[PDB]
Amino acid sequence: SNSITENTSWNKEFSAEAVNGVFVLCKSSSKSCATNDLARASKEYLPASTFKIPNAIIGLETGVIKNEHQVFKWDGKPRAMKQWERDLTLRGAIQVSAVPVFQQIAREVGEVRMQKYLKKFSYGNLEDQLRISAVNQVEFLESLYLNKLSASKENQLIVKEALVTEAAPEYLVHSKTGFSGVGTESNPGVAWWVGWVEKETEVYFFAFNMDIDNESKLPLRKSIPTKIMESEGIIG
Amino acid sequence: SNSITENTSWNKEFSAEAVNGVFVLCKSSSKSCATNDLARASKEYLPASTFKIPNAIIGLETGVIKNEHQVFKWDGKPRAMKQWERDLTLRGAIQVSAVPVFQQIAREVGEVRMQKYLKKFSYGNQNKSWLEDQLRISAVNQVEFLESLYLNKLSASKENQLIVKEALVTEAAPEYLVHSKTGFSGVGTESNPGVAWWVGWVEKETEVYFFAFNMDIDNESKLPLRKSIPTKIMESEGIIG
């Protein structure tokens, strides 16, 4: 029996940074989610680089991504960022959100196959022609964690390992950042931080998004959720 | 036909701490490895908790470990260590080297199948409930075995190999992922010192580094060196940190 609760206590962390956003934290064992804003938790936004998670699974399931050790070689021709100008593994391409690598994977999969898997994954309603909510992100990440997506357990495991961003004796953090851009002062951009924490035998799924009009605010997409999860005693 | 090259430059890291031990570091594959001591690199020692790597793979292959999300429930009966007195995941059991969890896995596997898997994995010298004490494995054999695991070439499903690889993650950074396992036989005596291990691999962008470290240890206070010496060597190589 799935449930969600509104917790005004986290508004502190948003107010202190003057951030308009939402944090959704779900405890797997109790099938209970908590958020600071139910309305925004259900609102759909451009996924930006969070879309690299389903794109990676689809890339492996279709065969476009050969296997776990697939290397995305750089032809030497300049790219939007120097961090993309080199050979990358799946983990490498995911961490730096390498646009050209995932655009190439998407082209080889094709429009029809890409849409077929996104419907099967219930992923929102091609990265720019799609919108997804924080609640939809945690549901999708839980399906991935449980290997319940329409793809082999092996391909789901490859993507889960490639998303590892923090390891401690008591927990493993799997996560993905997203940033659509600054947008305009009228219609701001969106910044995301989504993932899950395997802490002892408990699993916590999280999705954070915020309005962003200045690239200088990007660090807040990790600091606000990190402070909330630290105060919940989930991570350090 | 793998080769091992002696590198007297790391001797400094050992001598300074007055440590008798070996570090083996292989870039890309176990084909060409570097070490501070050719002789000791190939010398076989008891694996201690490093044995929990093949134990976990065999547990999964035999179905004793049902799947990736297996929980090892605590029966409430006091254990040798407080950190083992709770339910544990495969990663949790591996991280605290939970003896009771792995002893039970070994029993369910059976000494029969266990020995057939170890032979098929080329794990240690091929010459019951004392595997971590009876087995003998070299630092070179550890990096060869970890390279097979990494490449999914052991006689096990890709899925079971991937589950164990994820459970061994100990450090994550934007540029690298460290998979490792500690081992400690005990302090032994000055005449017969125990052995301390740190084995694993680093996925550094497109490159992979396999490592195996072991040292004589006759005093508890020296334990930190099993991680600090290899870390300092890999930090100087620009692999981690």
Give yes or no: B49 in active site. yes
Question: Which architecture, in CATH terms, is B3-237?
Answer: 3-Layer(aba) Sandwich (3.40)
Q: How was this structure determined?
A: X-ray
The C-alpha atoms of residue A40 and residue A132 are separated, in whole angstroms, by 11
Residue in B95, B172, B205 closest to A165 by CB: B172
CB of B168 within 8 Å of any CB in chain A? no
CB of B169 within 8 Å of any CB in chain A? yes
What are the residue boundaries of the structural domains of chain A, listed by start? 3-232
CB of A82 within 8 Å of any CB in chain B? no
Do residues A204 and A26 touch, judged by C-beta distance below 8 A? Answer: yes
Helix (H) or strand (E) run with residue A191 in it:
strand A189-199
Tell me which chain A residues have a C-beta less than 8 angstroms from the C-beta of B203. Answer: 89, 91
Residue to test with chain B: of A67, A68, A144, most B Cβ within 10 A = A68
Query: Would you list the DSSP string of B154-217?
Result: SSS-HHHHHHHHHHTEEEEETTEEEEEEEEE---B-SSSBEEEEEEEEEEETTEEEEEEEEEEE
Q: What angle do CA A18, A21, A27 make, to 5 degrees?
A: 125
Name the phi and psi angles at B151, rounded to 5: -85, -5
Q: Do B87 and A200 lie within an 8 Å CB cutoff?
A: yes
Query: After which residues does chain B have a break in its backbone, defined as C to next N over 2.5 Å?
Result: 127
Among residues B30, B49, B138, B148, the one annotated as catalytic is B49
Nearest CA-CA distance, residue A168 and chain B, Å? 6
A29 burial (CB, 10 Å; 0-12 / 13-18 / 19+) is exposed
**Tokens coding A35:** 């958020």
| Chains A, B: CB pairs < 8 Å | 69
Query: Taking the domain A3-232, which CATH number applies?
Result: 3.40.710.10
CB of B171 within 8 Å of any CB in chain A? yes
**Tokens coding A166:** 């923090």
Residue in A71, A157, A170 closest to B162 by CB: A157
Q: Is A226 helix (H, G, I), strand (E, B) or coil?
A: helix
CB of A235 within 8 Å of any CB in chain B? no
Do residues A158 and A152 touch, judged by C-beta distance below 8 A? Answer: no
The C-alpha atoms of residue A214 and residue B149 are separated, in whole angstroms, by 45
